[PDB]
Design an enzyme around this catalytic site. Sequence first.
Site, PDB file in Angstrom:
ATOM      1  N   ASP A  74      -3.218   9.426   8.260  1.00  0.00           N
ATOM      2  CA  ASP A  74      -2.573   9.919   7.379  1.00  0.00           C
ATOM      3  C   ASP A  74      -3.179   9.452   6.037  1.00  0.00           C
ATOM      4  O   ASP A  74      -4.077   9.118   5.886  1.00  0.00           O
ATOM      5  CB  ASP A  74      -1.097   9.720   7.470  1.00  0.00           C
ATOM      6  CG  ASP A  74      -0.738   7.923   7.069  1.00  0.00           C
ATOM      7  OD1 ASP A  74      -1.213   7.293   7.365  1.00  0.00           O
ATOM      8  OD2 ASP A  74       0.368   8.187   6.423  1.00  0.00           O
TER       9      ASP A  74
HETATM   10  O1  8Q1 Z   1      -0.013  13.553   2.869  1.00  0.00           O
HETATM   11  P1  8Q1 Z   1       0.459  12.311   3.594  1.00  0.00           P
HETATM   12  O2  8Q1 Z   1      -0.568  11.100   3.570  1.00  0.00           O
HETATM   13  O3  8Q1 Z   1       1.203  11.984   4.761  1.00  0.00           O
HETATM   14  O4  8Q1 Z   1       1.698  11.691   2.516  1.00  0.00           O
HETATM   15  C1  8Q1 Z   1       3.105  11.287   3.125  1.00  0.00           C
HETATM   16  C2  8Q1 Z   1       4.117  11.735   2.039  1.00  0.00           C
HETATM   17  C3  8Q1 Z   1       4.951  10.623   1.518  1.00  0.00           C
HETATM   18  C4  8Q1 Z   1       3.502  12.638   0.655  1.00  0.00           C
HETATM   19  C5  8Q1 Z   1       5.193  12.768   2.601  1.00  0.00           C
HETATM   20  O5  8Q1 Z   1       5.708  12.130   3.785  1.00  0.00           O
HETATM   21  C6  8Q1 Z   1       6.333  13.214   1.769  1.00  0.00           C
HETATM   22  O6  8Q1 Z   1       6.226  13.957   1.041  1.00  0.00           O
HETATM   23  N1  8Q1 Z   1       7.574  12.456   1.497  1.00  0.00           N
HETATM   24  C7  8Q1 Z   1       8.422  12.726   0.514  1.00  0.00           C
HETATM   25  C8  8Q1 Z   1       9.300  11.548   0.140  1.00  0.00           C
HETATM   26  C9  8Q1 Z   1       8.637  10.497  -0.455  1.00  0.00           C
HETATM   27  O7  8Q1 Z   1       7.645  10.122  -0.120  1.00  0.00           O
HETATM   28  N2  8Q1 Z   1       9.062   9.813  -1.669  1.00  0.00           N
HETATM   29  C10 8Q1 Z   1       8.435   8.769  -2.485  1.00  0.00           C
HETATM   30  C11 8Q1 Z   1       9.052   7.426  -1.992  1.00  0.00           C
HETATM   31  S1  8Q1 Z   1       8.673   6.458  -3.651  1.00  0.00           S
HETATM   32  C12 8Q1 Z   1       9.148   4.657  -3.149  1.00  0.00           C
HETATM   33  O8  8Q1 Z   1      10.021   4.314  -2.659  1.00  0.00           O
HETATM   34  C13 8Q1 Z   1       8.170   3.661  -3.166  1.00  0.00           C
HETATM   35  C14 8Q1 Z   1       8.547   2.394  -3.560  1.00  0.00           C
HETATM   36  C15 8Q1 Z   1       7.447   1.418  -4.189  1.00  0.00           C
HETATM   37  C16 8Q1 Z   1       7.539   1.912  -5.608  1.00  0.00           C
HETATM   38  C17 8Q1 Z   1       6.695   0.968  -6.696  1.00  0.00           C
HETATM   39  C18 8Q1 Z   1       7.695  -0.213  -7.259  1.00  0.00           C
HETATM   40  C19 8Q1 Z   1       6.771  -1.424  -7.334  1.00  0.00           C
HETATM   41  C20 8Q1 Z   1       5.691  -1.312  -8.555  1.00  0.00           C
HETATM   42  C21 8Q1 Z   1       5.388  -2.505  -9.091  1.00  0.00           C
HETATM   43  C22 8Q1 Z   1       3.891  -3.006  -8.867  1.00  0.00           C
HETATM   44  C23 8Q1 Z   1       3.720  -4.462  -9.242  1.00  0.00           C
END
Ligand code: 8Q1
Lengths: 459, 175, 128, 111, 220, 124, 104, 62, 88, 67, 178
Positions: free
Chosen positions: I43
Amino acid sequence: MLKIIIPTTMLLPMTWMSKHNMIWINATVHSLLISLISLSLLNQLGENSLNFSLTFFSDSLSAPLLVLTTWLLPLMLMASQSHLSKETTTRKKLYITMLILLQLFLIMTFTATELILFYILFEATLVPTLIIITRWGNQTERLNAGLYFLFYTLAGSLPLLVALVYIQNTTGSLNFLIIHYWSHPLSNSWSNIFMWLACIMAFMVKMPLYGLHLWLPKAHVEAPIAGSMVLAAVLLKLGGYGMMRITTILNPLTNYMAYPFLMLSMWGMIMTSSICLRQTDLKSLIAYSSVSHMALVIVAIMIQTPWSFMGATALMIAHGLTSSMLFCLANTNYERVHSRTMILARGLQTLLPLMATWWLVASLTNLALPPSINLIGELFIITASFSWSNITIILMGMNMMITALYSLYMLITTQRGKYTHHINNIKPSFTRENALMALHILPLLLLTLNPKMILGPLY
Amino acid sequence: PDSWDKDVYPEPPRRTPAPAPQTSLPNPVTYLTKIFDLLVDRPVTLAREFIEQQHAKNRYYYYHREFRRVPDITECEEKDILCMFEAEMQWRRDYKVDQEIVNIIQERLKACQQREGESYRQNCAKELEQFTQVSKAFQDRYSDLGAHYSARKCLAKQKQRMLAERKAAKEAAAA
Amino acid sequence: SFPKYKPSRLATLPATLDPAEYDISPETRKAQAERLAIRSRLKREYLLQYNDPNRLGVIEDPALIRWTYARSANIYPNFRPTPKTSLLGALFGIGPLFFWYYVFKTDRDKKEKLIQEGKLDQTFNISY
Amino acid sequence: MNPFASLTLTTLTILTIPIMMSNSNIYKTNLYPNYVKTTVSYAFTLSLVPLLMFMHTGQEMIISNWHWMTLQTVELSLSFKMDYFSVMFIPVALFVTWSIMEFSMWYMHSD
Amino acid sequence: TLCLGAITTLFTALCAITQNDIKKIVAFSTSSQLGLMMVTIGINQPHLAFLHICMHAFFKAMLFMCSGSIIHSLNDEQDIRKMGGLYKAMPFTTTALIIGSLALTGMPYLTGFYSKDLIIEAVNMSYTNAWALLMTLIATSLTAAYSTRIIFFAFLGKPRFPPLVLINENNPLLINSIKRLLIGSIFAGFIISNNIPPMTVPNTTMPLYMKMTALIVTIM
Amino acid sequence: GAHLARRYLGDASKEPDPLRMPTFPPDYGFPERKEREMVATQQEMNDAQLMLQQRDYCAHYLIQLLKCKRDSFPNFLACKHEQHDWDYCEHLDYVKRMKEFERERRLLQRKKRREQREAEMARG
Amino acid sequence: QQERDPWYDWDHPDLRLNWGEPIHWDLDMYIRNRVDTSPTPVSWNTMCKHLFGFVAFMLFMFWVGEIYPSYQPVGPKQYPYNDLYLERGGDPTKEPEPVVHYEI
Amino acid sequence: RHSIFAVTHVLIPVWIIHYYLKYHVTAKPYTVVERKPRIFPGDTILETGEVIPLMKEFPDQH
Amino acid sequence: SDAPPLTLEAIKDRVLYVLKLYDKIDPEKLSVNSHFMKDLGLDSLDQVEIIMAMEDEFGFEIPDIDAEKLMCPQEIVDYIADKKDVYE
Amino acid sequence: VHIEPRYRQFPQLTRSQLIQAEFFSATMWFWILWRFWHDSDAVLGHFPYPDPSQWTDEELGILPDDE
Amino acid sequence: AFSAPAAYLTHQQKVLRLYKRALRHLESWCVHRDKYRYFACLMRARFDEHKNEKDMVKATQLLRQAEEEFWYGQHPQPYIFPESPGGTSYERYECYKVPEWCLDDWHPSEKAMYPDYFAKREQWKRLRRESWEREVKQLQEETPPGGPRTEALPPARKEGDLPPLWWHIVTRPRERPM
Ligand SMILES: *OP(=O)(O)OCC(C)(C)[C@@H](O)C(=O)NCCC(=O)NCCSC(=O)CCCCCCCCCCC
Ligand SMILES: CCCCCCCCCCCCCCCCC[C@@H](O)O[C@H](CO[C@H](O)CCCCCCCCCCCCCCC)COP(=O)(O)OCC[N+](C)(C)C
Ligand SMILES: CCCCCCCC/C=C/CCCCCCCC(=O)OC[C@H](COP(=O)(O)OCCN)OC(=O)CCCCCCC/C=C/CCCCCCCC
Ligand SMILES: CCCCCCCC/C=C\CCCCCCCC(=O)O[C@H](COC(=O)CCCCCCC/C=C/CCCCCCCC)COP(=O)(O)OCCN
């Protein structure tokens, strides 16, 4: 001193009777010979002047100016003979005639022994310059530049004529020697106040003083390269010569009449120096730097101490050479790209290395790097000002830092970085341009070898 | 050497101690000095003696110009331009000579300070007082004249100082 | 959750922290489309003559000419005397002059008064 | 007489000879960095001798060799101070410079 | 001068201990040493300041040369977060850098010793600012702090650089230059301090807990 | 430090002032004080050009050490006894300075105690 | 201009400008050799508070250390010949007030 | 060619500078000023030949 | 001397080496034309991780706009070769 | 000398660099130990630091609170 | 750099960019390899948790919260590759990049050396001159009357053709021109 005056009047018919393809060669060769001849005026005495005749004389202040003028004419010819290639032979001879007449008027001006003749030639210098600017300039702003130049000059210069004839009627003479020996103090009167203003304001405008300087950027930017060279190198120093000649009769009123102008020269020094930090046009940047340096010279003349006078003479010579070189350097790029914008052609050090080192040396001289004569003059003026008032050091140091800032800013913008991609008409530097740069810069260092020749009569 | 006058540029006896080494180790300084003199000073001395004998074959002289003592600005009528010109030139030459006198005293002071080492504060008292006197008199004569100085402005400054001194002296005598 | 970030003039707001990018409407999408269209047509116009074998010189940029003209020659025709411009001109043009005049006049008056009254440590002050 | 002055001035002077030869047919070859490094090494070994003279007899000098200007009563001349600070710092700077140019002959090989 | 030097040395030492570019750490160490020079000038010991200049030149220059050797070997990489185990990969570089870091911190009977320990002793035995004294001591501790930072993050541990290993320090120019500066940073302090005449009165009577202040703060 | 702690935290008027010292006459508690002896004359120190701060009561040992340094030049380790003698003389001078500080401290101690006792007697 | 994308293929890479787009009025102030307005890890008005607090605290503590100076429990250093009166400037025709130090 | 560099870059400059210092700079007064040599109790002056007296009966308190 | 003149064969070898050290890819199933999404069933996040792995291995960074559209080992070796002016 | 890249192997070393590094580290440590043996006082101090509170009131010249 | 950008970034594009940035800054924080691997797998799981969500509004809201967290936790001094737009060697070799047209200004004595090189250069110039007009015509055919909507260029569609606007892409100076 007719041994210098007559050869220029002979430059005239030699130019007008030379064949079509040898005007430049003959003019350059004989102008260089005339400069070599004029070099003999540097053997100055220690107490009085060199009174050649009843009408002409020379001291250690006018001799370096005469040498600068005679040396500048060949440089002007070499820099002009490029952009006039498509011109007809008659108008090329006319242009050379304008330059020759300008040099002759300047030579007589710097050595006239009485004030009315000095005034006549000081004003006669206006006609060839105006014709040059408004006939051989490139853009449509040359007409307005000529109008501003002419009327700014005359508005300040006519009251000088009225005051001069008044002084001659009251005292009986205007010969510099009789004027100096028979000098008397000026009383604190409204009549004396306006006489002081009339005697000073013409040379104030010619410097130019901050506030009356709006003609200079227009005139120096719209002019052809020879016009810019003669304006920056020599024509700005007529005000300083006249100031340091006429202040001998204005004492002791000056002690309290210089207070406004000093302020205008000091704070203005900062203001113009700041303008160069935000200039998008190279020629305007050079013109505003000239304004700031001339403000420093005005301070030097106004405080009226021997160290200040020596510094003013040194700074006048040094600025003449440096500003001429900077204008020529900018003109080379202009002939390359036909635009005056600084950020258009960038990273030229990659493509023009020797021109890049010329740029570096000119910028280093401009920001008063020791032991150049630029630094000598600036430092002597600064010490004189510190003696005058210890608070002046703040403004002088601010000006030094801003001067270094904009000089190196212009150098970095034009020479460093990466080249503009689409500009592909940058040909190698010609022998003429490199020779012009070398002939500008070698006298500067040779002069810092022996600086007493440009330190004035107070030395 | 005798190229200058020792009375105007006075120098001390230059007593130097004698080398009295306490150790039998060779002294690198003396060996380096021997190598230096042999390899440098001998060719330099030879070339200088050759140049001197060349100069001795063609010897000519130059003279110090003598100036008379013309009347000063005090012996000149109000608008007599010839006497004024003569007096002005004489005054300017005297001004130059006074400048060179101050220069000589300053050179004396600097040489004393360098020579005396760490005792300069006490051992250069005579030079310091000589410079103080000479600079005080020079300041009384020529200070504050500005550019466009002349014999007349100096004379007016002297007259004003004399008037103030006379007023102070007569006020003191009134006590 | 975490302490916030406060933007200012000299430290601006990051794109990923800007809510204007997380609330998208079709009008904004078509606005982005036309922005990209303008940029692309300008890029094509530049690249057509940039790669021309027969071109020699400087490709004239009307944006640069407009900028220099607006910063140099177009200022006075568009100037109008207003209370803001009048007050700013008076202040920035006259205030520094009067301030420096007052400072230098006061300093020199003090120095002259000390000289006349008789103590300024003028010893060795030969050069002036 | 007194090799102190001659050696102290020669240490300063010989450093400029490569700058004079910046236009000869050595600046255009690849032998120039070695030439400059050798010159700096020679300057260091030459400056080691006035340091020995100072360590032995504490010799200090000032050399006003060229007179430039005399304004009215202020004479400006080319004067060198050869006291303890100068004679001690010059060899240290020369040694450090020698090492650094030798290092640069390798660090900047591809420049 | 004393206050300026103290604030400079402490501020730059404080900034140094969190930097990740090796050249930046050496630059901030240089600034801290210059602040120490201003501190010893401010307590009326100019000759000690000049002595410190002369000694500091040696080990600071050779530390920068070691950093350049590391940078050139690791394909123009300067961040210490990508410098792994070079203690064995570069033996000469690591020995030179260790010797320089020990001379910088004032380890006894090295070039840094004869200047820095004397400077600290003179500062402790003078009528000076209390805050300047405390800032100087804290900066002396932070010097060892950032030296430890450099050594730990660049030479110990496991490799963190790209797999293509180009490590090669077998060139006589680099080896000879670093070797000359290394002999300097070992013996120059003893040679120089024993030949210059005494230009100041020494501190021959000080408390035992204060004669060891520099060593104690360095160890902590 | 402890003296700083007592001065800046305790009774400062009960501790000596380092700048204004001594407060008491040099014969307040000494029946007989002997003048300190200087071994090297002014001319010798001037000729040796020692320094304006090295011309203390220990300058004779410094002159000896400088002479030994200059005389045994190539062997720079040959002057250890003279160096030690100069260090010991400076150490003794520092001990006398500490003794003076302590004497002034306890003289102020006694003065304060006597003043408080006399005031207490005056309370009756 | 520093805030511009460094990975886009600009017509002027160092300037980060394209041919024909409008140019900011203050471009020469933002040429990225100059004033930078890029976002910072710490918010403005927080860096200012920290920096001003640090500088003010240092100034106050330096003044405090000035008026609470450190020193050693020693008396003033003594010098033999009237505190070197003749060597500290001179004036050898005054015979100043004797400065005598006694044994202790 | 084995030792040309020393001859051309050290010997010639030192010759020129030694000439210029010995016969031109030192011809004028005060151009070259040396610090006065140190005199200690016990040395003999080369010119005068006098002997400086010893330094007054050290107490020898070791 | 600096790094040797890296060639096409070295790039292909090293990209395939790094991909074979990936625990989500079967070494014998992976070829140089093998698409990541189809032929290997990975993926988007896995592709991002592969891109970062190649960045760390080759010592340079591939921007997100360019990296997101590299789905074959041949595409990666072509991009790296074009970046370093590898023509052999 | 020519040394080749190795791609995830420990770099090829030389006997010369190893012996030189070891020799210089040994030289440093030997110098430190030797100097501390000969000049220990430069670290530990040489002259004893007296205690003012032990000095008797007589050698400081103070009367026993009599006048 | 080599790819024509779009008018906007999709939600997946933004999520992937945030993922790469978070991984890079986490690697900056955890300098050691094993610690970075552990926390990188934890971050991968944290990203995988919400990948299946279907509500787009709460997905973009979670992305916004993720962005805010990253700014707070970002490394003040993240590791930058030496030749990256923030690295220590970013534009180090731009002073050595000389455009090819400069060779047209060489003296004949200069071109006397490298004769084969200038013969090949003449070949290349002739090829460019013969292909220019076909390139212009092809570019004129394929664009809409309202102008191009994106800055992506088409390839050559005939055997003898060349991809339009190719000269400056092909004749780049070098990455290490000296
Ligand atoms: O095309 P694909 O490769 O399959 O992508 C999958 C995708 C995620 C795009 C797809 O499933 C989708 O559209 N999902 C929709 C929901 C979604 O993905 N929302 C985003 C999630 S954000 C999250 O929770 C990440 C947590 C970490 C954030 C960073 C915090 C830490 C940073 C500090 C650095 C030291
Ligand atoms: C753009 C820049 C151009 C250059 C600017 C040049 C500036 C020229 C100004 C010259 C300054 C001196 C002029 C007047 C001298 C005295 C100043 C004034 O304050 O006079 C006072 C007197 O008080 C009043 O000010 C009198 C003058 C009132 C009218 C003048 C105001 C003019 C406004 C300024 C106009 C701006 C100048 C530009 C005009 C186009 C002094 O009091 P007092 O000691 O008793 O008189 C001394 C003079 N005496 C002895 C001869 C009588
Ligand atoms: C002593 C009198 C003057 C005192 C100083 C007053 C401040 C003077 C005003 C400064 C004028 C600046 C305008 C022109 C500068 C040109 C613009 C420029 O250079 O760009 C800024 C450029 C870019 O910044 P980087 O961090 O390198 O970013 C690189 C990565 N992007 O950096 C600079 O040059 C900034 C320099 C500005 C200095 C201003 C601060 C100075 C304040 C000094 C106060 C302390 C005094 C010391 C007291 C000592 C005790 C006696
Ligand atoms: C680029 C623009 C520059 C503008 C400069 C022009 C203004 C220069 C200053 C004014 C010059 C006028 C001076 C007139 C000639 C001087 C002769 C003189 O001083 O003689 C006086 C005469 O003095 C006058 O009459 C002066 C009258 C002035 C009238 C002209 C007004 C011009 C404008 C005045 C204000 C502006 C001046 C400064 C402006 C600066 C530029 C901004 C003595 O004559 P008597 O009658 O015999 O008196 C003694 C016996 N009772």
